[PDB]
Amino acid sequence: MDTIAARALTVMRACATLQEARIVLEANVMEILGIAINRYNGLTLRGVTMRPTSLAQRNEMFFMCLDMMLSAAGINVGPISPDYTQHMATIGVLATPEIPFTTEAANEIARVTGETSTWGPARQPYGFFLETEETFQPGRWFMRAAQAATAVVCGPDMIQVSLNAGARGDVQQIFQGRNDPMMIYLVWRRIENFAMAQGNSQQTQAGVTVSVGGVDMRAGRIIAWDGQAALHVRNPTQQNAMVQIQVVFYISMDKTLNQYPALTAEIFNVYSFRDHTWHGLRTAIRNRTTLPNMLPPIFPPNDRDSILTLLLLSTLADVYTVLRPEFAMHGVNPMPGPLTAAIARAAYV
Amino acid sequence: MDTIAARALTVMRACATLQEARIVLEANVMEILGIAINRYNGLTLRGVTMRPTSLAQRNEMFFMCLDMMLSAAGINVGPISPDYTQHMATIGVLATPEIPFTTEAANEIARVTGETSTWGPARQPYGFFLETEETFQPGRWFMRAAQAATAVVCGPDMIQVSLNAGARGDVQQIFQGRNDPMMIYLVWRRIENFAMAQGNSQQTQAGVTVSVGGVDMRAGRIIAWDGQAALHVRNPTQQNAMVQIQVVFYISMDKTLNQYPALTAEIFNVYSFRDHTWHGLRTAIRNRTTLPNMLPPIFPPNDRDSILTLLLLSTLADVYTVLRPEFAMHGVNPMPGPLTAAIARAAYV
Amino acid sequence: MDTIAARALTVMRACATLQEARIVLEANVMEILGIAINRYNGLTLRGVTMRPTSLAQRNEMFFMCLDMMLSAAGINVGPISPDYTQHMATIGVLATPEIPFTTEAANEIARVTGETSTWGPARQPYGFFLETEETFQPGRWFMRAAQAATAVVCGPDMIQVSLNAGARGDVQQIFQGRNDPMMIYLVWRRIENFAMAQGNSQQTQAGVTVSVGGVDMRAGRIIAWDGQAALHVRNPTQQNAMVQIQVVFYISMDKTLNQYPALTAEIFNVYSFRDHTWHGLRTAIRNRTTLPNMLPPIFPPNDRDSILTLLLLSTLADVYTVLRPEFAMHGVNPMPGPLTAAIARAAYV
Amino acid sequence: LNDYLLYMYNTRVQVNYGPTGEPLDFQIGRNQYDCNVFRADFATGTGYNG
Fold this sequence. Notes:
This is part of a larger assembly, with three copies of chain A and one copy of chain D. By secondary structure, chain A is α+β, with helices and mostly antiparallel strands. Chain A is built from nine helices and twelve strands. The radius of gyration of chain A is 29 Å and the shape is elongated. Chain D is largely without helices or strands. Chain D: This is Core protein VP3.
């Protein structure tokens, strides 16, 4: 199955090699296409040429990559064009052990299937307290009734603790319950000048100490907190004190855009416009998938199928570029006037 | 044209394989360099050997890579060295169809020319309100004369609306006119404790609602906003209320650093020092380009020629590393003492 | 030495190609492994097959990849398994000239040795004022005794100057002394509504100017600052003013995650779980290095040996995925189940 | 079979013998391939038919 996808990839990547009419190919290519094309036309009956020159020959080859791309993904696009029809048989061609694939493509899939099958620690892209409903003014005093120490949020990655003179207490519970962190990296500071309950300026005297799991920690230094240890703040000072604790970044098992090398660059290449023909194509293709048809996913995907699809489409995009295919598509009305940023803008719904 | 570029790239990466003298080469390489060199020494009359050993043989090969690198980027550095004379006929060599290029090289150039010619949605690196002249204190009340609801910026990615008891009004106009966003991702929270015009602490009561285009949205949840729909805030509470709205990230068709796979890592490799000989060579090359000669562009380039150039240099850079070339350069004086983080720091003007 | 590392990578990436039993291999692959395994079994005396099928044949090969992966990174794990024993003769195999390596591998190593042996300007990851101990409330008036202008930090990438009516003064010293920037990109704004020492709202009148090294800069525009020039702030206005200067980002010669193309994903791959047998194997190997055995280094390494290792392990991780080896490891008690997100979480100490 | 897999009237191929002196231990082929498979186990029938 992976082998299948690897082959499909190898072929499309090999088709992108066709830039000119009389150029000579890399030994590697003439070995791949020669076989592939023959086996393809063998079960497809289409007229794919090794060196397409016309346009109908180029469209044909593109339809081929398209077929292999869709197949390798497991997509049944349905009636999307009058000029193109999808041959389910392409899957059988890709299952032919006789068609070789590149080492590059081999490892490429191995990585996807490898990581997409298991979990791992990774730097989360957004602030820790991004999903909070209530936020308080940064640098302002706030003491919840009956408490000597009051921890509270003040931003997407910021919290501040209001300690009374000589007060102490745990703060960890304001962090827990959200997400499922493995290690939270903290860096606390002293709010030297903060506003009081009335508005008057106040000073935080040096001497306040923040200890994690017992051991005392310095201010302005990153701290490896396990999220479970006791986050204890003490104020031995004879005045009101306020200290801010920052979640510089945290790591969890949720997949990020760095699960696979330059995944982002690909995603962009796929969501890109090019022209109306490509636009609609790429769209209609993703309609069958869980991925958003024309606007990047808010949250990075986590399943083999999705990741794969993207890589395949990205490659098919490059193939599209080199082949310069022209053909119809349901609901796509091409505007020939030199294409600009303005026209492209409009196309996105 | 793309073919010319891909060939140049292939040759450089092919030369990059020569790390030692006796080592056996991948038969694929022997074909490439066998042809390339034969047609180069024929149209340039230089003595480049496939298996260099001396040093002058190594330099000669590098000058070739440089000649191609330049010819491919369409650059004419002029008289920058007493040892090197850029022979412009290199383009003629890079146009020889008998010279093959790698599948990798093909897909590489196809990508550059691919995205460079069209637009696409990107995550955008900086904050939405980065280019604002004015800013307000985060968490402080402000009511512009005669209004009942006043939106006001308070950060690079932050705004806050001051609502009177029972007030309501649109906010969208504060976002408009800036950049060219396609989709702005929001996440609003309630500023539970803010400062009044006088300084006293005020509370925001639960009941405030923020609706996008008519539909009511929850607090602390990311929202896909097109930027045109009505961002209407309502305060059915019998007290003053202040809410903070955050632009976690937005998307626009402006090229970012993720247009081409690991563009950043490539850039770094080019802007690196290595040694003075390299440094100056690289600078002198970029003096011909619209790209900053020794400091990362603040804004990511967006044209074929730019990106293309960078890559050709990045490769030419590795070619430099492996070959270990030694030559004179006008206006550059080599300091042979071991090279330290200090010596390099000084070379960057 | 570099030649040695590339060969090891070539072999590993080649072993990854064996996804199935009867699949047709690229003539290139057979030619390589044919020599590699023939010479390895000669100096090691083990039985590795080109077309492994059983399991012991699969382990034998994986062990070979491990032996090479280690020899290349220069590691000696010692007694960590009853099934496996590291042969030091493996280094002699990776030096045998008759064993070729790919163009891809050569260009991969040349990139590591390249940027690792020198420095370069790169966008730093965290905020400028991250390693600070004291922070003040953003938007609050604070004038240090006897001064007409008082600059003070209020965020990880923020500072705010408090000017008196008709006051002027240099500010550059608050930035200096930290890190070792080459260029610090700024963008200043006028705090249109700030809190006074007492709590009342105060307006900043238009007219306040900021000039770098003499020349006057606009508000809300990015400013390339060399960190040495005179950052002067003036206030010709007849009232109290407050402006915020932001360090959007800055560049320094410290290695970042973008030193090597998509290094992030390569790291994530190695730090991923897969299964207990992997987890332990990867950990036990990292115990011989300066790298954290099971959690992403907060700070991106900067030495040849460190990065080189990450790549060899990232690749060996893929080799693991494809070969599906099964063997014992001291201290590791494998749970033969299907594996869940929970079980992986628990495995990380 | 053995005697004749070993009789090369053309250019010779890599014959990587096995520790056992028993016929068909080697692995002739530029891709190896056991000839040990075509041994002769009666309980398996690994060499001859079916």
